[PDB]
Design a protein around this ligand. Sequence first.
Ligand SMILES: COc1cc2nccc(Oc3ccc4c(c3)OCCN4C(=O)Nc3ccc(Cl)cc3)c2cc1OC
Length: 294
Amino acid sequence: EHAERLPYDASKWEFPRDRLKLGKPLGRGQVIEADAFGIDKTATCRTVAVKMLKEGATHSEHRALMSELKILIHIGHHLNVVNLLGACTKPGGPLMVITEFCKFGNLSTYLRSKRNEFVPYKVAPEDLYKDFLTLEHLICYSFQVAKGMEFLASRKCIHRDLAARNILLSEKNVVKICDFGLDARLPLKWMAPETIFDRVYTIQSDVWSFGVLLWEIFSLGASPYPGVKIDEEFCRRLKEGTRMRAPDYTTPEMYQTMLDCWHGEPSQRPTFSELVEHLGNLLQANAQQDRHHH
Ligand SMILES: COc1cc2nccc(Oc3ccc4c(c3)OCCN4C(=O)Nc3ccc(Cl)cc3)c2cc1OC
């Protein structure tokens, strides 16, 4: 609330505009691809994503972007939350928020591009499945998002719109939680019943959304509630207990976890801490099935 007015450690986040080389747009504020000169002590040059205010934006829009920067600063650093690298706030140019760049984009679109490049486990010679996704990949992604959400929860922050479209995939299969801040998106399909009917958002409603995210992950980017009209009867049957069927690439345990996240009673849903532990076990157990190289 009014985060745009929180203290700002310029010495820690301010970055010289001239050490930035803005490139092509990635989407539209508006995110642009760019090159940064020595923004971190890990490389003198690095690709980054920059979010900046459009031309002549309202004061209200200016507060909104500044509020987002303050929230990111407040949340802090975590491997599974898009990393804030710096910002350009001082006079001389536009307000700019700089984050790490995630090469592969949103997880939803990416997964759909791998529909014909997936197998539960690779079989030697593995070169036949080069760059293919496997159950280990999918469980690993689920596990990383759970850890990111567990982190946000510990910062007392509620995402409010946890979906695969808000998950970014970087290199080496590392995923980052983000928010493009968005209708044709049918956001209601990720909303918990209490949120739909009472407009209440809580870390427990986020867990419900996490369940839909798992369904998306294990359906390889399919659209939630396939072909179902999202009208009043939908909300009615949803509150009555109607749930999605198990997606194509799920495992028995992952589907049960989805069902657990979709519990009618918010308080009966698992917590992200319990999800991190549980998903960590499923990952370890999955590896136990792939023993060719032991
Ligand atoms: C190559 O394809 C893309 C790769 C990208 N890699 C990194 C970042 C990208 O854009 C974003 C995405 C989200 C946010 C952002 C920039 O700037 C800061 C705000 N933001 C957030 O995620 N904010 C945020 C994060 C967590 C919480 Cl809890 C609240 C707000 C990208 C956009 C792409 O093309 C689409």
